[PDB]
Design an enzyme around this catalytic site. Structure first.
Site, PDB file in Angstrom:
ATOM      1  CD  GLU A 237       6.493   0.557   3.932  1.00 31.40           C
ATOM      2  OE1 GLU A 237       7.001   0.167   5.009  1.00 31.40           O
ATOM      3  OE2 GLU A 237       5.255   0.689   3.786  1.00 31.40           O
TER       4      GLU A 237
ATOM      5  N   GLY B 133       6.507   3.058 -16.710  1.00 29.05           N
ATOM      6  CA  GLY B 133       7.826   2.661 -16.253  1.00 29.05           C
ATOM      7  C   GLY B 133       7.916   1.326 -15.531  1.00 29.05           C
TER       8      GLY B 133
ATOM      9  N   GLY C 131      -0.289  -1.938 -14.888  1.00 22.61           N
ATOM     10  CA  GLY C 131       1.048  -1.371 -14.917  1.00 22.61           C
ATOM     11  C   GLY C 131       1.063   0.125 -14.653  1.00 22.61           C
TER      12      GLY C 131
ATOM     13  CG  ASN D 107      -1.998   1.100   1.087  1.00 18.94           C
ATOM     14  OD1 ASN D 107      -1.677   2.245   0.769  1.00 18.94           O
ATOM     15  ND2 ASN D 107      -3.259   0.747   1.323  1.00 18.94           N
TER      16      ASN D 107
HETATM   17 CA   LIG Z   1       3.665   1.365   2.173  1.00 17.22          CA
END
Ligand SMILES: [Ca+2]
Length: 221
Positions: free
Chosen positions: A60, A176, A173, A52
């Protein structure tokens, strides 16, 4: 019709962020990302390990881009040579959820199944898209069918993938973003009517044509 990938199941997928998510890309080693030249802009932060894009979920890595290199022959009107390299300021920490994807040794063929992934953001399109990573399994189309779909527009540096029937749109998509076939990065999301119209294929930069340039550029920067 595609599906929700599942968190961190596409470990080479990156989000490019300049204040907001504006493009996808593919991690090809601990310090370099491949994306579309049409994604070029200043102040890029590379976001790895995302699912998300609006919630910090715990996997992350946010790393500033140190350098972007647009292909020498990129043409923004035709989108010929729509490829760009992004160097990371620091090396990503590689693990099972954040991993590089291999460059191709050979080009892929029509009929080969690929995985297209992304958050569905077409740069500067103003279109809506989801916040979690989406996926589509789709075949590469023949040269002739690709050219028939987009007369006068398909160069030797492009290929088509997707579906010419089914009455659906393919908006997974990002600009890039990756097209991965048999564990190799064969395409970059470039352009097309595949999301705007039903029964149209996407058009992708043909990565196998650029492996020499990618390797030489990385080796010197
Ligand atoms: Ca996140």
């Amino acid at each position: 019709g595609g599906y929700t990938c599942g968190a961190n199941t596409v470990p080479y997928q990156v989000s490019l962020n300049s204040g907001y998510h504006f493009c996808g890309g593919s991690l090809i080693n601990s310090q370099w990302v491949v994306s579309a030249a049409h994604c070029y802009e200043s102040g890029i932060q590379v976001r790895l390990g995302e699912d998300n894009i609006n919630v910090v979920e715990g996997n992350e890595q946010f790393i500033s881009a140190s350098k972007s290199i647009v292909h020498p022959s990129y043409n923004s009107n035709t989108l010929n040579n729509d490829i760009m390299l992004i160097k990371l300021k620091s090396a990503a920490s590689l693990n099972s959820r954040v991993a590089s994807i291999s460059l191709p040794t050979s080009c892929a063929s029509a009929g080969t199944q690929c995985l297209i992934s992304g958050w569905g953001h077409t740069k500067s399109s103003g279109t809506s898209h989801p916040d979690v990573l989406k996926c589509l399994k789709a075949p590469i189309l023949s040269d002739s069918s690709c050219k028939s779909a987009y007369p006068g527009q398909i160069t030797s540096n492009m290929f088509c993938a997707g579906y010419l029937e089914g009455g659906k749109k393919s908006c997974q998509g990002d600009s890039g973003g990756p097209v991965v076939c048999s564990g190799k990065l064969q395409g970059i999301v470039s352009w097309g009517s595949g999301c705007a119209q039903k029964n149209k294929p996407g058009v992708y930069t043909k990565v196998c044509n650029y492996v020499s340039w990618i390797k030489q550029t990385i080796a010197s920067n």
